[PDB]
Write a protein that binds this ligand. Structure first.
Ligand SMILES: *[C@@H]1O[C@H](CO)[C@@H](O[C@@H]2O[C@H](CO)[C@@H](O)[C@H](O)[C@H]2NC(C)=O)[C@H](O)[C@H]1NC(C)=O
Ligand code: MPA
Ligand code: NAG
Ligand code: CA
Ligand code: CA
Length: 534
């Protein structure tokens, strides 16, 4: 029933879901299989003429979150679940996974010129797919608001398949393949979105967690040049939890170790060209070898095995430096956080209970940090359980004497204070920032990492006012205030500015506040950012 005519003249059919029209599973690239593994995506050249696109394709290969070279119960358990026929039926994954999904309000026709919201999912750069992020809530609210938008989502390679690094990967020019998948999807939207009723000049990119750090990377891509065929690929960005990635170069120390580990795992330790050896192994051996490297929930936690790393080609340098040096695209941005970003990651080191163990955990995580810097950090984030995350809970959530401590640190470096650093240095366009405390009181996790996905795609709550409405007004008008909320969202100029600069959210609704908390942690972490890179 729904129909579109692509740039190359092909004409496809979608599905009419009543409350919206969807075109799911459109291939935007050749399958990154065989000798195309770990390499840049190749544009799709073939025919889609007369084809039906009524369901999401398989996600790219997934990594066991509890994977690691060690053997243990959670690793065993998740593997048991992940390799099950039931799981593989309900959630199919494949190396041939580079597809794109377009969903629009019902009745939309070519030429409508609706603003476009291109979603980039977050899954710790190791798991994830588009099928788990329902656009219906967004789309519907946009219609109700009288600001209809088109929701676009793109699959990208994760874990070893999309973020392998090391000397060989650098030499070949194959770094950050997963980010390149994302970049091609954008180019595809530029060329084809008009056929669906969207305006290619009104694209707002947005993601959460890894999707968010992805949006930052796109702003920094090619020293800030975001054009394609002479026109910008997007006019704005919304980052939900995540700014710059605190990572060393692709041919760095941990990028090289992981590469080597993965190679030994696949049986390529003796190969003179391990990379070629890796392209030759079956998908099973590769999937297996990857699950034997640390997953995000493993003890390594935030020190991810796979993630965006400066390559000196498309991301020319340390991401913090690029921001200080003004090498970014000049676009208006909304960037916010959840009050308790680190409680999730803090669950991965619950066998650390004494300050002596805490100091060593940090030392193993941040190899570039001197004992002096470790000491300063452990002074800014003290053992006092009342001072940690879940913030403001007193002596509760004391799973261990160090849990709340470790959570306060990880969530700040990885997201919360990382954001403030971007904000204090960024002059590309108007900035807007928010902080959620919607789930205050939730035992153990607090207003935890990713709860925004729930209030943006699944359930309604005070938070949906920002996650849907405000995000919609911004994509349409480049100002979240056009949404018509009762609380005006003030512009963010600096964390040292007088007056409220953050939009806040609690169980009841919205209010304004200041971005001046944990200043001591900020200087401990960012006085010399590279001391804390992974
Ligand atoms: C907490 O548990 C981790 C995970 O097992 C311990 O780290 C591993 O320890 C073994 C030896 O027991 C090493 O061979 C592994 O390489 C370690 N894994 C990692 C990912 O580093 C860690 O020592 C324990 N921490 C505390 C404070 O007891
Ligand atoms: P993000 O993708 C975590 C990014 C880690 C950065 C370290 C430098 O968070 C995920 C988001 C999804 C929706 C749910 C799980 C959550 C984590 C991977 C635990
Ligand atoms: C990466 O950088 C090179 C050199 O600047 C450029 O030609 C290439 O197009 C860039 N890649 C992407 C995906 O933009
Ligand atoms: Ca090596
Ligand atoms: Ca500039």
């Amino acid at each position: 029933a729904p129909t579109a005519t692509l740039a190359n003249g092909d004409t496809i059919t979608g599905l009419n879901a009543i409350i919206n029209e969807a075109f799911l599973g459109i291939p935007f690239a050749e399958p990154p299989v065989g000798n195309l593994r770990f390499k840049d995506p190749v544009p799709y050249s073939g025919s889609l003429d007369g084809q039906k696109f009524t369901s999401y394709g398989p996600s790219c290969m997934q990594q066991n979150p509890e994977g690691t070279y060690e053997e243990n119960l959670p690793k065993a358990a998740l593997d048991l679940v992940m390799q099950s026929k039931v799981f593989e039926a309900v959630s199919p994954s494949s190396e041939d996974c580079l597809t794109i999904n377009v969903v629009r309000p019902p009745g939309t026709k070519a030429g409508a010129n609706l603003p476009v919201m291109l979603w980039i999912f977050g899954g710790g750069f190791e798991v994830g797919g588009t099928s788990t992020f329902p656009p219906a809530q967004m789309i519907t609210k946009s219609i109700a608001m009288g600001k209809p938008i088109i929701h676009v989502s793109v699959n990208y390679r994760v874990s070893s398949w999309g973020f392998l690094a090391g000397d060989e990967i650098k030499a070949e020019g194959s770094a950050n393949a997963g980010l390149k998948d994302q970049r091609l999807g954008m180019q595809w939207v530029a060329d084809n979105i008009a056929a669906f009723g969207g305006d290619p000049t009104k694209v707002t990119i947005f993601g959460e967690s890894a999707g968010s750090m992805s949006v930052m990377c796109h702003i920094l891509w090619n020293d800030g040049d975001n054009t394609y065929k002479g026109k910008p690929l997007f006019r704005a960005g919304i980052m939900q939890s995540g700014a710059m990635v605190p990572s060393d170069a692709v041919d760095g120390i941990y990028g090289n170790e992981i590469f080597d580990l993965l190679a030994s795992n696949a049986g390529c330790g003796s190969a003179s060209d391990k990379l070629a050896c890796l392209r030759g192994v079956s998908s099973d051996t590769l999937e297996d070898a990857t699950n034997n490297t640390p997953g995000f929930l493993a003890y390594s936690s935030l020190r991810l095995s796979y993630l965006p790393r400066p390559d000196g080609v498309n991301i020319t340098d340390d991401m913090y430096a690029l921001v200080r040096e003004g090498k970014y695209a000049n676009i208006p941005v909304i960037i916010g956080d959840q009050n308790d970003e680190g409680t999730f990651f803090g669950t991965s080191s619950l066998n650390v209970t004494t300050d002596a163990q805490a100091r060593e955990y940090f030392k193993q995580s941040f190899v570039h940090a001197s004992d002096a810097e470790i000491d300063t950090l452990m002074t800014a984030y003290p053992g006092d359980i009342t001072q940690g995350s879940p913030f403001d809970t007193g002596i509760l959530n004391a799973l261990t004497p160090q849990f709340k401590r470790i959570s306060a640190v990880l969530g700040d470096l990885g997201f919360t204070l990382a954001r403030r650093y971007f904000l204090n240095h960024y002059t590309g366009g108007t900035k807007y920032s928010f902080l959620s405390k919607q789930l205050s009181g939730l035992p153990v996790l607090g207003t935890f990492h990713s709860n925004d996905i729930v209030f943006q795609d699944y359930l309604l709550g005070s938070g949906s006012l920002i996650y849907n409405n405000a995000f919609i007004a911004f994509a349409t008008d480049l100002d979240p205030n056009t949404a018509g909320l009762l609380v005006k969202w003030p512009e963010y100029t600096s964390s040292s500015q007088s007056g409220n600069n953050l939009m806040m959210i609690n169980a009841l609704g919205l209010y304004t506040g200041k971005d001046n908390f944990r200043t001591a942690g900020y200087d401990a972490l960012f006085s010399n950012p590279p001391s804390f890179f992974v």
